[PDB]
Write a protein that holds these residues in place. Sequence first.
Motif, PDB file in Angstrom:
ATOM      1  N   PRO A  34      19.893 -25.698  -5.262  1.00 48.29           N
ATOM      2  CA  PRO A  34      20.234 -26.418  -3.644  1.00 48.29           C
ATOM      3  C   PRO A  34      19.308 -27.635  -3.416  1.00 48.29           C
ATOM      4  O   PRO A  34      18.269 -28.016  -3.915  1.00 48.29           O
ATOM      5  CB  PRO A  34      19.930 -25.246  -2.880  1.00 48.29           C
ATOM      6  CG  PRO A  34      18.890 -24.430  -3.539  1.00 48.29           C
ATOM      7  CD  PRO A  34      19.195 -24.714  -5.291  1.00 48.29           C
ATOM      8  N   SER A  35      20.063 -28.464  -2.714  1.00 45.09           N
ATOM      9  CA  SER A  35      19.334 -29.841  -2.124  1.00 45.09           C
ATOM     10  C   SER A  35      19.646 -30.153  -0.525  1.00 45.09           C
ATOM     11  O   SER A  35      20.541 -29.517  -0.273  1.00 45.09           O
ATOM     12  CB  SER A  35      19.968 -31.199  -2.840  1.00 45.09           C
ATOM     13  OG  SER A  35      21.023 -31.449  -2.341  1.00 45.09           O
ATOM     14  N   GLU A  36      18.641 -30.346  -0.042  1.00 48.28           N
ATOM     15  CA  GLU A  36      18.608 -30.795   1.381  1.00 48.28           C
ATOM     16  C   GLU A  36      19.268 -32.149   1.955  1.00 48.28           C
ATOM     17  O   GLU A  36      19.283 -32.135   3.065  1.00 48.28           O
ATOM     18  CB  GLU A  36      17.392 -30.669   2.140  1.00 48.28           C
ATOM     19  CG  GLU A  36      16.091 -31.458   1.428  1.00 48.28           C
ATOM     20  CD  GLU A  36      14.986 -31.799   2.103  1.00 48.28           C
ATOM     21  OE1 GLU A  36      15.088 -32.037   3.439  1.00 48.28           O
ATOM     22  OE2 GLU A  36      13.953 -31.141   1.827  1.00 48.28           O
TER      23      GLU A  36
ATOM     24  N   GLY B 266      23.444 -30.710  -0.430  1.00 46.13           N
ATOM     25  CA  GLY B 266      23.634 -29.105  -0.494  1.00 46.13           C
ATOM     26  C   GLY B 266      23.666 -28.734  -1.774  1.00 46.13           C
ATOM     27  O   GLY B 266      22.608 -27.784  -2.036  1.00 46.13           O
ATOM     28  N   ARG B 267      24.072 -29.204  -3.093  1.00 45.27           N
ATOM     29  CA  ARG B 267      24.046 -28.774  -4.274  1.00 45.27           C
ATOM     30  C   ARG B 267      23.615 -30.071  -5.076  1.00 45.27           C
ATOM     31  O   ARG B 267      24.235 -31.071  -4.979  1.00 45.27           O
ATOM     32  CB  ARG B 267      25.474 -28.123  -4.886  1.00 45.27           C
ATOM     33  CG  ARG B 267      25.181 -27.218  -6.040  1.00 45.27           C
ATOM     34  CD  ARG B 267      26.210 -26.522  -6.681  1.00 45.27           C
ATOM     35  NE  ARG B 267      26.488 -25.252  -5.692  1.00 45.27           N
ATOM     36  CZ  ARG B 267      27.464 -25.293  -4.793  1.00 45.27           C
ATOM     37  NH1 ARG B 267      28.370 -26.091  -4.660  1.00 45.27           N
ATOM     38  NH2 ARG B 267      27.415 -24.163  -4.212  1.00 45.27           N
TER      39      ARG B 267
END
Lengths: 96, 207, 550, 96, 97
Positions: B193-195, B198-199
Motif C-alpha cells: 500500500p501507498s499513501e 493507494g496500491r
Amino acid sequence: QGIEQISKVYMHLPQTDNKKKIIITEDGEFKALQEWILETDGVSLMRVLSEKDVDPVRTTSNDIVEIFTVLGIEAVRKALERELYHVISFDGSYVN
Amino acid sequence: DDEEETYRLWKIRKTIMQLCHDRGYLVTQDELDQTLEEFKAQFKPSEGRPRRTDLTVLVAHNDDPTDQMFVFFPEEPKVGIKTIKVYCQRMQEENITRALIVVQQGMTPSAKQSLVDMAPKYILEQFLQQELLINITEHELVPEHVVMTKEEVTELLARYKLRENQLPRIQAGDPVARYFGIKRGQVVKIIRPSETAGRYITYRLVQ
Amino acid sequence: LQDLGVANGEDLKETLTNCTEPLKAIEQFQTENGVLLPSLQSALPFLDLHGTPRLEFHQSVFDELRDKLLERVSAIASEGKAEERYKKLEDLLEKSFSLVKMPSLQPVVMCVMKHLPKVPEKKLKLVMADKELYRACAVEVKRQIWQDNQALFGDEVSPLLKQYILEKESALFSTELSVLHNFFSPSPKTRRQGEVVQRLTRMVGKNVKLYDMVLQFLRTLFLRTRNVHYCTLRAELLMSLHDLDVGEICTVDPCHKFTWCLDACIRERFVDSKRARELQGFLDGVKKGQEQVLGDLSMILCDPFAINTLALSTVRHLQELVGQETLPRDSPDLLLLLRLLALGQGAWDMIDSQVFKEPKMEVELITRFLPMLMSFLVDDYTFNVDQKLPAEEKAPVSYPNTLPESFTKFLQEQRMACEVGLYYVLHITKQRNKNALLRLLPGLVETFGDLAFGDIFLHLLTGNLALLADEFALEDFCSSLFDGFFLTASPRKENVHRHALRLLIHLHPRVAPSKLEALQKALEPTGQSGEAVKELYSQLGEKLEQLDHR
Amino acid sequence: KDILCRLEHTTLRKVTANTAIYYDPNPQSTVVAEDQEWVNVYYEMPDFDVARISPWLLRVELDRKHMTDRKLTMEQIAEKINAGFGDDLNCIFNDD
Amino acid sequence: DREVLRVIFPTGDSKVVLPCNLLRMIWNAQKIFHINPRLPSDLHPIKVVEGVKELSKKLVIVNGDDPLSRQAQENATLLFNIHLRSTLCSRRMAEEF
C-alpha cells in the motif's frame, strides 16, 4: 533472565493516538484503545519477536540494519521511510 | 525446559506449514490452524517424544504433485556431514529434490560447503531455529511478495522494454527470499500500500 | 374423533340426514365442535362479520398451541419428577395415538416415543407397518423396534449395505489415471462423511444391541462374499460412533482404541514407532481366556486402505534397511507389520472358525526373501551411482534384471511375501525404476490366490501406469502386464478383465494402433463377466474406432 | 511488568548484595554461625561431599529487594549456575 | 472502496494529499452557474454515475490495454478514483451540492 543487549525497558501507556491500538469496532468506527507498550535500549529484534505473549506484527525497531538482517529489503525500505518521516515531522514541519 | 520446548516446536511447526502454504505446497487448513493443545494431542517431550525425526514432514505441490518437499529436524546441536548424507539418501529413496532443514542453534561450516557443492542436483536450505520461531511475512513492514513465473517476467520485460539487470535487486540471502526459496534469476512482484496512489506494485530481481 | 367421545363427519351427515330442521341441527353441531370458552360464543359472529371465518383464528391458535405442545413434550421429557413426568407422557401418548392417523399429532407422539426408553410395542409395530410412520418416526422409536426385534433392522440395512457395495464396486472400477490423485486418497474419516455409515450410526445411536446386530449382519455377508468392504464398514461404523463420542461403544469395546490407532496409521499410510508401540502393546494384551475379540480385531484390519498401509509400511522397512546396513532379523517394527497383516488376512478364517494364536513367520521368508529384496535395491543404487559418477566405465554396470527363482517362488507360494512383493512393485512404479519394474514383474504368472489380480493392487497399478504413458506405444511394456500377467487370470475373474479394459479405455490415445487392436480382440468378453465387460467393451470398440482415426 | 522482567537482561551482579570467599575446611562446619543451621539442613544427606569437597567456600548474599522486583526465587539461580557449569560447582542455597 | 481505504489507512487518518481539490471545484461550479441549493436540481443520478465512470476512464497515468498496464493504471489512480467516487456520488450530488 532476559535477552542480552537489553539494558533497560520502559513501560508506559501512550496518550498519543499514533501509537495507540487503533481498531475498527463492529459498527465500522475507529476506536483508539489505550494499551501498554515497552520501549527499550539496545536491540535484538529476532529474540524479542520470538518471545511468548509478544505482538510479533506491530513490534518494530528504530535500528534499520537490524530490520534488514531480520526482515528484509522491503521491510527496511518501509522502516527507513517511517524513521526519517518521524525525524522530519517531529518539529512540526511537513515535506511531500 | 519441556513446556517451553513443546510450545517452541509447535510454533515452529505452525511457521513451516505457513511457509509451505506460501510456496504453493498443498497443506490442509487444520494443520495451518493447529492449536498448541492439538500439537499436544497429536504427539510431554523431555525424552518422552522429542523424536525430531517424527516432526519431519512431506508436502506436495498444488499443481505439480511429483514436485514435493521434505522438511527435516536434526536433533544434534550443530548438523554434521553424516546426517546430511542420511537426508540425501532418504531423498534418493523418495526421489525428492527440494528439502529445507532447520538447525537447533547452528550448522557446521563443513556442512555449509557440503550443502552448496551438491546443490544443482538436490536443493537444500538451512534455517536457524530462531528464524522460524516467527513468520516474518505477517509483520506490518513486509509487503506482499509473490514469485513470478517466467511467462510473467517475459510479459513484464516486454511491457516496459526492460532488461533484467535494469530492475531493482534483492539478495538471495534476504529473509523473505529464503522464506520463498527463490534462486538467482527469479523475479518477485512486491505489492505494497501507498499513501499517494493507494496500491503500488514493484518488481525485484533475485541477484 | 370417536376414540375420545367426539363426533365425525359421518355423524354430522347423520345429524343432517332425514331431519325436518337441518339448519338448527347444523348450528347444534357447530356448537358441539367449537372452542369452549365463554368469550368466543359472542365474538364468533363479530369476527365473522369482518370476512374472517372462525377457522382462521383457529388456524393461528392451532399453530401456536401445537408448537407449545411439542415444546412441553420436550419439557416433560426433561422436566418434572421422573415418575410423574413419564406418567404424564404415557397418558398423553394414550390420548394422542388416536390422532396419529390425523396429520397433526404424528410427530408429537414420535417425540414422546423418542423420550421414553421403552413402550408397549403395539405402536412401534404400527410405526414399522405404516410407511408414513416408518418415514416420520423419530430416531429412538426406530431404535426401540430394532432393540425389540431385528426384522426392520435387517430390512433397512440390506439396501444400505447393497448401496455401500455399489459405491465400492463403482469406485474401484473407475477409469481415471493421473499424477494428481487416485481413489485411495480419502482417509477413512473422509469416507465416513458419506451418509450411509453416518445414518447407520444414527440408526444404532448409542445402543449396544444394534451394534451387535450390525456386527452379525456384516459378519454374515463377510463370510459369504470374502470381500473387505463389510470389514471397512464395521471400521467406519465404529469410528463414526467415536466421531459422535459414543461412550456406550467406545469405552466398552476393546477394539475401539485399536481402530483409533489404525485410523492414524491409515491417515499417514504407515505404522510409525509411536502408534506401532501402541498397536503392539494392544496385541500383547491378547492372553488366553479373553481372546474372543481377535476375530473382530483382525476383521478391522482387512480394510483396503489398511492393506495399503501395512504393505507400503513393509516396503518402506525393506527400503530403509538398505541404508542402515542391518539384516532383516534386526527389524522389530517390520515383524510387527507382518504380524498385523498376517492377522488381518487370517481374519476371515477366524470368522469361520475361531483360532486364537499369534502366527509364526516362515523361515526362508525372513532369511532369504527380504535380503534378496535389499540386494535388489543395493544393485539399483549402485547402478545409479555408477551412472552418476564421471566416466565409470564403457557401458557402465548393468543393473541385474535377473530373477533369483526364490523371489518368484515367494511371490507365488507365500501369501504375505506375495502381497509385500506386489506393493514393492507398486512403490518402484511410483519411483519409475523401470529395470526393477521388469525385474520383479516376471514371475507373477503364478500367484497365491490371485492376490496380484485383486481390485486394490490392479487399481493402483493402473494408477501408476499413466506415469510411463509413452511406453505403452512400445508393445513390451504393456505386454509384460497384459499378454504376460493379466491374461494369465483375465478370463478367471471379472475384476481383472474389467481392470484391463478400463486401463486401455483411459490410455487409448497413446497405445500403438495394432497393439490396442490386438488388445481389444484378445481382451474381448470371454464369458466369465456380465454387463460390466459389455459396457467396457462397447467403450473399447468405440475408442478403437477413434484410434483408427489416430 | 512480568514480560518486561522476562526480556530485560538481568545478570547475577544486579541481584547480589556482596560476596565473600571464606575457607571453612570442614564443610560440615561453617565459619559463620548463622550459616551452620541451614548448612546442616543440607548436610544430613551427603551431596557430593563423601569425597573431599574443595576446602574453599564462596558465599554470596542476594538482595531481597531486587529478587522480589525481578520475580526471582532462590532455586532457579542455582539451576542456572549448574546449567552453566555442570556439576563442576556444587551449589547450595538457604531456604527462603 | 471503504474497505480498501480501511486496510490502506489502518490509523483512520482521513487527511491525504491528492491532485485535484474536488470540494473547491464543486464550490466554483456552484458559484459560476449560480446554483440555488434551495430548489430541486435537474441532474440525473445515472448521469452522475456514467460521468464519473467515463471521467475515470479518461484519467490515465499508464496507457495500454494488456492486463499489466490496466492493473498498473488501476493501482496508480486507485486512491484518487476512490476519492472521486466518494465525493461525486449521486447521493451527495443530489443532496448537498
